[PDB]
Design an enzyme around this catalytic site. Structure first.
Site, short mmCIF file in Angstrom:
data_model
loop_
_atom_site.label_atom_id
_atom_site.label_comp_id
_atom_site.label_asym_id
_atom_site.label_seq_id
_atom_site.Cartn_x
_atom_site.Cartn_y
_atom_site.Cartn_z
N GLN A 40 0.83 -1.19 0.00
CA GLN A 40 0.00 0.00 0.00
C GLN A 40 0.86 1.23 0.00
O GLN A 40 0.66 2.12 -0.82
CB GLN A 40 -0.83 0.03 1.25
CG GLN A 40 -1.83 1.13 1.26
CD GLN A 40 -2.87 0.87 0.24
OE1 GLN A 40 -2.97 -0.23 -0.29
NE2 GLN A 40 -3.65 1.88 -0.05
N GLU A 69 2.66 -25.21 9.46
CA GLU A 69 3.13 -25.40 10.83
C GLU A 69 2.14 -24.96 11.84
O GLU A 69 2.51 -24.46 12.91
CB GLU A 69 4.42 -24.69 11.03
CG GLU A 69 5.47 -25.27 10.12
CD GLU A 69 6.72 -25.55 10.89
OE1 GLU A 69 7.78 -25.12 10.37
OE2 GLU A 69 6.62 -26.16 12.00
#
Ligand SMILES: Cc1cc2nc3c(=O)[nH]c(=O)nc-3n(C[C@H](O)[C@H](O)[C@H](O)COP(=O)(O)OP(=O)(O)OC[C@H]3O[C@@H](n4cnc5c(N)ncnc54)[C@H](O)[C@@H]3O)c2cc1C
Ligand SMILES: Nc1ncnc2c1ncn2[C@@H]1O[C@H](COP(=O)(O)O)[C@@H](O)[C@H]1O
Lengths: 184, 387, 228, 386, 387, 388
Positions: free
Chosen positions: E340, E367
């Site tokens: 952004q 994970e």
């Protein structure tokens, strides 16, 4: 207060960085002496003479000054210092310049000053520090100012209008602890 | 047809009434009422005079016979003034609604008519110390012993609970533990004065401090079978049914609050200066007021939409919960920020945002929690996609 | 041959530098410091020669505060055998320079009985390019500055160095001083194994008083500013 | 060296004392103190007896001579109990900071010493009806007059102002309106019994209701030149400097209150049932609880870090500001979430959690608001780049 | 005896090496490796030469026997370079961990020793087409034939799954579906050349493209008895006890990615002007850089804590899961924000930030997801308050 | 008025089934291919043109339908549910058109609108430069009057369809004096794309929406005749500024379209995937996500609807458009990441449709005004209500 300029040169050709040095020299307001060392000196000595600012050109011709070795030249400059007593010894902050002066300084037991860009006065100087990202102002209180001078920081002195005497330099004993072998 | 975000001339005028009211009569006493906790009878009463209360009661009982969109739009204006007082006002609609949707000409004329002639209050009575969100877990007992039912148990957190002529009550009527909600509960109208009804102490709450919240005990309480809703065991549907035409009015309440917060914060940001610029020239502040306006604007449509779905005879659950969930959150968000923009002053009793923060919290909690609004939204949504 | 390698703890080049309000110098507190990148190059050269088995041992010297432990330790991890820290409190550190250091390094050189002092050509902090020259000066040995190539030839060094137009080539007699320039070599990493092995190798902390050296500087910084 | 996250054996004693005091003595009365809003004089005296107060004072002056990390352990424990109480306690040590970091030994022995002999209070007076965040905006003028200074102005929102023996006071020295912060302010020690000092009424706030907060007016108040802090015009640097050692302690308050909220809420969701299950067995509740545990741990490590930074001799401005901002916000998020877990009960004053919502908002306002905190972080952060 | 937040001098040198290599050798080629999805072999071999891989392997096995705190700090430095490559090299620790925590001298010398000698890869084989987060719903059967075991079934999403010397592989040992999970699984070491293994084509994913991830079929794979981890049924303890020493490493990678987002956004916001000033002089952008710095800072302490807890031989399930949850989330947050801040450019393929958005998403999935991290932290949290 | 109403005109239900049919039967089967290669999706664009669901704002007297803003959004959302690469190529059209619509005269409107009526030609909006995007008044492209002509010297950047356009709307700096206010320093032009001085640059390679072409283009000495200025000199800035009212609500409608897709994909998946014994939707965490997502889309829909109604009605809609654009964009991203999430490892994979949505969604926070810029506009608009 007198000043001494080690002229850088080559193949009968005053190195430009010396003219800038000589401008910087006259700023100090003292008879400007310039010392030409080498193996064929007389030609450059002659150009150096024409140069404005220069009261005395000293010539040290000798085969041993092949490749302007700092172990040969240092005692030469030292020998000149004894007969004459300069307050200032400068040279063009080039590879030749930076190699020679800090040694000369060691030999004098004064602390040199590198790569200066302005001259605030006969004992105050301005270099850059940290890839030039700051500006350092140094007061030197030595018996002798030794220092090299940034080329682009001073104008090239007029190559004509000089009324300089050319004199034989004092002589030194060939050291032969180093030797020039070759170039490019 | 096609979309329209424009009010009727009639609507534009209801709105102007309630604005005028909330702005000149509510706002200038609310703080005072909030400090003391006194129930604001002058106000309830002035609301009734103006036709801003008991709005859902049909014409055939002398009521205004107005839609949920109308109640919403009124309710935002009142909540802007104070949600303590508007929650006391709305209280009446929550209690009336199960009679409005599910009782018979007799029941309506007796129990709605009266509200139409005197400013009385009534209340909704379902929650108990042991259950609020899980309505299927209420334990208040209701057994038939004659041409009437006996009531034992305890209600908690009843709005208007100590100011009410009558109660809409919901009791478990079927002893069998394994009995479904669809069958296990009955809804009652119950006059407040009955023998055996003991009203507890006024409960002291963080916010909406002048709303009347109390606990009620039912010790061997007898109501006439005439006062049963559609029939024995159809209670859950009646109560669940009400949530369509009440839930949007609760969300407008929050939007009202939210709007107040925005105005107080904007009016202040336009007169306080720091570091040489007006608050409003500090981009971080502009951006706060910008996200705040957004939230209000969207939450408004949120409730407007759920109000229209029902006013047009569609079922509502999904849009209503979206609105309730959303307007709820934003009131809370808008209140810290409005407190925040006033700074140290915002934190203090002499300014009006402090209260709004305290008030804004019930919107995540009553008339269905933020969490259970999400359960409802989820299940309604997941259905659109199942064979 | 025994070798002495000088290493200087400098404001890590990546740190973008800030100048003091009081305009006395630059900001040196809580400020990352690594080994000057030319010293890195010299330490590398000690080691390549020690690899070519032409050097029996490599000493690493540093001058300042105690944080020059950090600096000597890195050198040790690259191939240096023992370290020497010359101790100067971060008060006297301020007014210490190439003169002091060369004086130091020379006394050091004759004492530890060395045949080569390797330095980097300039420190990225003070930009002096003075130490090596000055140290050759005090020992009266020859100097190959701005070395870009080096080679032992019995008792003679052949130094290719970097001069304004191209390369120049010297032969020096052999106690010699050599200062490293960028093109000299690509310095190795401290390998995690050797960073561990280097904890074992010891650093003798001494003082300048001991070596026989005075620190007084008739130089003096007056001011430091930002650039134009 | 190495990183470490274990308190020192001594630190653990402070923590034990402080947890015992807060749990056995603060919790049982805090509800009441909030209800009545009166100044908790006895628990203060006791905090004082027990070594849990004026902790930054040097051994020199009869203090316990402890660090910011130590001060932080204690305040977390006191705040868990009540931030009203804990505020009133820290206010002293904020009062003291400008004298500790910038007094000479006369002033330190004089104004710190007394706090050693007797459970006295002091305050920090910088805020004004006109300026809080914008410190260079304060308009209380101090004029010189031979061997003493005349203070004219008005301070607002003073913790313990009104219960203090003396004040730290910041004032606009230089009357020329073009002069920089760096030279426009002098900081004074001002004895309170001094004539001209009108202490205003007790201010009635949302939260931390039992803290003494009030405005005070200064009419021709005279202050001897011996009570100037470093010199004329050094007021700013003085005040500014105090913040490194204190901001982490407000952060730890925020973490105390937070912790309480998680405790309350967790306790409750292990015993309330809905739809046949304990609250804790609804995944939405668990996820809240998780997220809450998450924020307290992060929040506590942020102040811990800040506190160690200053205690180890360096400036901690960047970390302190992070700690404040992050702890302040998560304080408020945890409290609203605790109320949320407790349902209607939560909204009710007979439970411990609605009080937390009203207390926590302060943690995003005093001692530098959330926004001022981000300004500081951004400025610190950006500055490591150009 | 005192909190400390200063590294050992040993650890600073580690960091300086890890940072030298990452800044100078990973970064200059990370975009190539991301464009082409080719496996960063030259780089692994370098990092291996440097001592930066298999840091956990004990001394008596030819390794460095280094702590979890050290891997974390190394791996942050590498993630900053590329999480593609940081992940390829981390997966070796992940496959090795079961062996390091739970394997006999013969096993540790055999299978860890190779890793000291050539630079080979190994992989952790657990997920399947139909269970990932529900490890317990793993269906890859393993059966005894005295002598040895016979593996049947199918693994998905295996890091290094096609470049591995061997596997830690977890399989259903026990057919009884009423069997408890803690005794149902056996974990094996499984040499990858073994007849019956069919490795699949590279999986073409959105981010960390240069990581090798692929699915594997096992058909009648013969695995020798001396390769069983502790004994039959012990697998689940083993598999689970590994995450202790790996989870903080993964978090440390998310934070790597995060600094890099932070750094790129700050550089850019220091050169780009809009409306007459630098991006940094618009408060909204400062405030962004502010909130990014804080999230980076705290993500870092959280993994540093987790890493230290386990290095003190305490178990760190609470702490690791805080770090993995928080690092995951903020890495995602920082990525979009960097994208952004760099505006149009950010979204383009030639600036460095867009990769970071694509790579960061994995941190909320592999994970242990953001969801199941939160279940663990809730489990661990509740247990402190119960009896 | 009459009541509030949230019911489409039968005509609009009619337009909706068409756009939805195309989007669902033609776009969806091919959209993953076009995202893989970046091939500009010519068959679909032609087909969209053909089907009447392109150039919809063109007024009837140039041979278009003269559809409204609400109708354009209605359609946008459907095409964007299929693909926003595709939907963006279609839109680019409206965006280059809009200033010709709002500010051209009959001879311009008819020559340049008229031609899109008879072939699926593309046009472009040419404003953004390397050095200025958000700060429009910062653009540097030069326009010097030289005779009955204008010469254009400048670089342009990130231009949708920039390489496929029959013509461009171009904003430029008219007047050299730096101190000259925006309301007077710019001129608006129509520039035919094949004019001598113009050099399209290469296809620019992005994270998202990889099938529209966006390109930089340079104008060296470009000749543009008088008859192609928009209102006259110094008018350029108001003219560009005024196109957004009619178009911001459509780009928001785009965001909403990808948002809905994400929800749909994520909902279908959670309905069929099991873990720990039950289907994902039976885990409360997931349920709640699906719920918040459901909320955000709904609200984002009312938001862009609201904006398009206000303008359809003939008021200036700056405030409402900017909420729509801010809120729609923000939720589109949020929903894209959550869709990936709900799908687990599968979501991160290329064979499942959700990662694409995640890559496409980011642009809605950038172009046609960024989130910050949206927020500036709104705060501005809000704060005026509070002054006299
Ligand atoms: C694929 C896509 C398609 C595009 N298509 C077109 C098109 O066809 N036609 C066209 O003309 N342009 C187009 N653009 C340009 C696009 O409009 C701009 O990139 C965007 O509007 C502003 O972008 P920038 O890169 O110049 O942002 P910058 O001006 O470089 O700003 C970068 C960051 O700073 C923030 N920021 C800037 N100023 C402020 C401020 N004052 N206060 C707070 N924050 C601020 C921004 O919000 C952003 O986060 C396109 C862009 C993308 C990449
Ligand atoms: N304080 C110091 N300690 C050790 N060696 C140094 C020091 N200063 C300079 N040197 C050596 O001298 C070289 C450059 O010095 P200078 O002339 O100041 O740039 C370095 O590369 C070192 O090898």
């Amino acid at each position: 207060q007198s000043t001494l300029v080690i002229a850088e040169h080559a193949n009968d050709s005053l190195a430009p960085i010396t003219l800038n040095t000589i401008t910087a020299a006259t700023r100090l307001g003292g008879e400007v002496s310039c010392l030409v060392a080498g193996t064929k000196c007389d030609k450059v000595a002659q150009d150096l003479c024409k140069v404005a600012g220069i009261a005395k050109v000293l010539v040290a011709q000798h085969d041993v000054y092949k490749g302007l070795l700092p172990e040969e030249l240092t005692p030469l400059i030292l020998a000149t210092q004894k007969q004459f007593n300069y307050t200032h010894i400068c040279a063009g902050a080039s590879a030749f310049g930076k190699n020679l002066l800090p040694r000369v300084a060691a030999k004098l037991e004064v602390a040199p000053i590198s790569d200066i860009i302005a001259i605030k006065s006969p004992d105050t100087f301005v270099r850059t520090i940290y890839a030039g990202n700051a500006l350092c102002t140094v007061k030197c209180d030595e018996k002798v100012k030794v220092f090299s001078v940034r080329g682009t920081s001073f104008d090239a002195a007029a190559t004509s209008g000089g009324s300089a005497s050319s004199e034989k330099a004092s002589s030194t004993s060939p050291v032969e602890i180093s030797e020039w072998l070759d170039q490019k | 047809l096609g979309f329209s975000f424009e009010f009727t001339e009639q609507q534009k005028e209801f709105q102007a009434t309630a604005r005028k009211f909330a702005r000149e009569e509510i706002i200038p006493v609310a703080a005072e009422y909030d400090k003391t906790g006194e129930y604001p009878v002058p106000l309830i009463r002035r609301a009734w005079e103006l036709g801003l209360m008991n709005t859902h009661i049909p014409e055939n009982c002398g009521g205004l016979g107005l839609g949920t969109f109308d109640a919403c739009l009124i309710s935002e204006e009142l909540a802007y003034g104070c949600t303590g007082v508007q929650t006391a006002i709305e209280g009446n609609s929550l209690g009336q609604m199960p009679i409005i949707i599910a009782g018979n000409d007799q029941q309506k004329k007796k129990y709605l008519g009266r509200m139409t002639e005197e400013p009385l209050m009534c209340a909704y009575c379902v929650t108990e110390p042991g259950a609020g969100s899980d309505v299927a877990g209420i334990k208040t007992k209701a057994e038939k012993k004659g041409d009437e039912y006996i009531i034992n148990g305890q209600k908690m957190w009843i709005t208007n609970g100590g100011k009410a002529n009558w109660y809409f009550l919901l009791a478990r009527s079927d002893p069998d533990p394994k009995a479904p909600a669809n069958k296990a509960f009955t809804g009652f109208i119950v006059e407040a004065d009955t023998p055996g009804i003991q009203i507890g102490r006024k409960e002291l709450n963080m916010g909406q401090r002048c709303s009347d919240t109390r606990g009620i005990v039912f010790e061997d309480v007898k109501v006439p079978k005439e006062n049963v809703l559609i029939g024995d065991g159809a209670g859950f549907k009646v109560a669940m049914g009400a949530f369509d035409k009440t839930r949007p009015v609760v969300a407008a309440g929050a939007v009202g609050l939210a709007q107040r917060a925005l105005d107080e914060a904007t009016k202040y940001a336009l007169e306080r200066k720091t570091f040489g610029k007006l608050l409003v020239e500090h981009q971080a502040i502009s951006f706060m007021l910008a996200e705040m306006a957004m939230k209000v604007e969207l939450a408004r449509m949120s409730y407007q939409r759920a109000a229209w779905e029902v006013d047009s005879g569609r079922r509502n659950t999904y849009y209503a919960s979206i609105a309730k969930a959303f307007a709820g959150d934003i009131a809370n968000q808008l209140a810290t920020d409005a407190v925040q923009i006033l700074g140290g002053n915002g934190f203090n009793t002499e300014y009006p945002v402090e209260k709004l923060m305290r008030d804004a919290k019930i919107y995540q909690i009553y008339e269905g929690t933020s969490q259970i609004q999400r359960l409802i939204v989820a299940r309604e949504h997941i259905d659109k996609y199942k064979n | 041959l025994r070798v002495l390698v000088a290493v200087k703890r400098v404001i890590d080049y990546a740190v973008k530098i800030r100048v003091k309000p009081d305009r006395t110098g630059v900001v040196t507190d809580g400020v990352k410091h690594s080994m000057n990148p030319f010293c890195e190059i010299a330490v590398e050269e000690a080691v390549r020669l020690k690899e070519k088995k032409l050097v029996k041992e490599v000493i690493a010297v540093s001058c300042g505060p105690a944080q020059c432990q950090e600096t000597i330790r890195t050198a040790l991890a690259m191939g240096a055998d023992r370290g020497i820290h010359v101790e100067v409190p971060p008060a006297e550190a301020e007014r210490l320079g190439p003169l002091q250091v060369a004086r130091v390094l020379a006394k050091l050189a004759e004492k530890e009985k060395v045949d080569l002092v390797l330095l980097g050509k300039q420190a990225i902090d003070d930009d002096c390019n003075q130490t090596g020259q000055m140290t050759a000066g005090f020992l009266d040995w020859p100097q190959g500055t701005f070395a870009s190539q080096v080679t032992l030839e019995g008792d003679k060094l052949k130094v290719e160095r970097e001069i304004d137009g191209g390369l120049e080539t010297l032969r020096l007699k052999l106690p010699a001083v050599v200062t490293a320039d960028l093109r000299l070599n690509e310095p190795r990493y401290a390998t995690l194994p050797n960073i561990m092995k280097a904890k074992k190798k010891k650093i003798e902390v001494i003082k300048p008083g001991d070596l026989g050296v005075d620190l007084t500087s008739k130089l003096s910084v007056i001011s430091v500013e930002d650039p134009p």
